[PDB]
Design a protein around this ligand. Structure first.
Ligand SMILES: *[C@@H]1O[C@H](CO)[C@@H](O[C@@H]2O[C@H](CO)[C@@H](O[C@@H]3O[C@H](CO)[C@@H](O)[C@H](O)[C@@H]3O)[C@H](O)[C@H]2NC(C)=O)[C@H](O)[C@H]1NC(C)=O
Ligand SMILES: *[C@@H]1O[C@H](CO)[C@@H](O[C@@H]2O[C@H](CO)[C@@H](O[C@@H]3O[C@H](CO)[C@@H](O)[C@H](O)[C@@H]3O)[C@H](O)[C@H]2NC(C)=O)[C@H](O)[C@H]1NC(C)=O
Ligand SMILES: *[C@@H]1O[C@H](CO)[C@@H](O)[C@H](O)[C@H]1NC(C)=O
Ligand SMILES: *[C@@H]1O[C@H](CO)[C@@H](O)[C@H](O)[C@H]1NC(C)=O
Ligand SMILES: *[C@@H]1O[C@H](CO)[C@@H](O)[C@H](O)[C@H]1NC(C)=O
Ligand SMILES: *[C@@H]1O[C@H](CO)[C@@H](O)[C@H](O)[C@H]1NC(C)=O
Lengths: 148, 73
């Protein structure tokens, strides 16, 4: 007689990591940050279609043929608890991309909390608009999750 | 705000349907008979490896390069 068992009772929090903006036909490297070993259950709701993708890995790679706003949802149920996080992203076509160096010292005070990164990008956008007199909602700053 | 919900509380019984014998390098059409719509969660333990396959469908198709006795769960 055989019996497979798994032991991961408590789940704390999850977060869906995805860039707020990318062009059409571009591969998106969606990440599902969660509390966990290779024993992880991930339901992925990429778009309108109900049928979710199953994954044991944190990340998936997908594309978007259409533009506009896309709802991306991820659900985690490793044990007997259900967590879920959603995020709406913009898929554009008319834009120009500029790389941006930050000062090194910031790295020594840089937690990867997405809200910290959001506020930093917002400050950069405000300063750009104040020093170029160009519209402010047409400038999107994303400061990545990397250690540098 | 968005929230996905699913509603299938009771599960009665299951049964694994598989032929008792087949040769090597032959495709096996394993079936998992269960109480259900396309909302079905299936973990497949094909052999020695712990990592199970995920499936929403009843059936899977696999092969065996080695002979002997295979545990299919
Ligand atoms: C919950 O919130 C916490 C903060 O309260 C987040 O924790 C931080 O997450 C980042 C990203 O995973 C961690 O940085 C990582 O460090 C590893 C090295 O250990 C590096 O290889 C990765 O590339 C990444 O930079 C960070 O250490 C971690 N802790 C803190 C204090 O910032 C967490 O992401 C949030 N997650 C959930 C599921 O709620
Ligand atoms: C539980 O046990 C019951 C019997 O008490 C099994 O029920 C029987 O299962 C077979 C195979 O699925 C059914 O035959 C099927 O009929 C459909 C048409 O409806 C046909 O398209 C299929 O090819 C197949 O031949 C049968 O009707 C069903 N009921 C009876 C009274 O025999 C069941 O398979 C067992 N399953 C579990 C999960 O415990
Ligand atoms: C996604 O990120 C991982 C981690 O760096 C990398 O190995 C992989 O090539 C990336 N894929 C794409 C399509 O960006
Ligand atoms: C988890 O399993 C996958 C199988 O698809 C494998 O690619 C990955 O390396 C495994 N990770 C760990 C940490 O064992
Ligand atoms: C498995 O059975 C289904 C149902 O008849 C059939 O469509 C499929 O081709 C079969 N595959 C193999 C490899 O026997
Ligand atoms: C269930 O979803 C799968 C998607 O892989 C599809 O192939 C199948 O036709 C669907 N079945 C039903 C009954 O909707």
């Amino acid at each position: 007689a055989v019996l497979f068992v798994q032991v991961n009772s408590p789940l704390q929090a999850l977060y869906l990591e995805v860039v707020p903006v990318i062009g059409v036909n571009q591969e998106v490297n969606l990440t599902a940050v969660l509390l966990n070993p290779n024993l992880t259950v991930f339901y992925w709701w990429i778009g309108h279609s109900l049928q979710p993708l199953l994954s044991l890995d944190n990340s998936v790679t997908t594309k978007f043929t259409d533009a506009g706003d896309v709802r991306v949802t991820v659900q985690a149920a490793c044990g007997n608890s259900v967590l879920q996080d959603s995020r709406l992203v913009r898929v554009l076509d008319q834009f120009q991309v500029v790389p941006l160096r930050f000062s090194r010292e910031l790295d020594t005070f840089n937690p990867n909390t997405p809200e910290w990164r959001e506020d930093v990008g917002l400050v950069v956008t405000r300063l750009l608009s104040k020093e170029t007199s160009i519209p402010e909602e047409l400038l999107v700053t994303v400061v990545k999750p990397g250690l540098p």
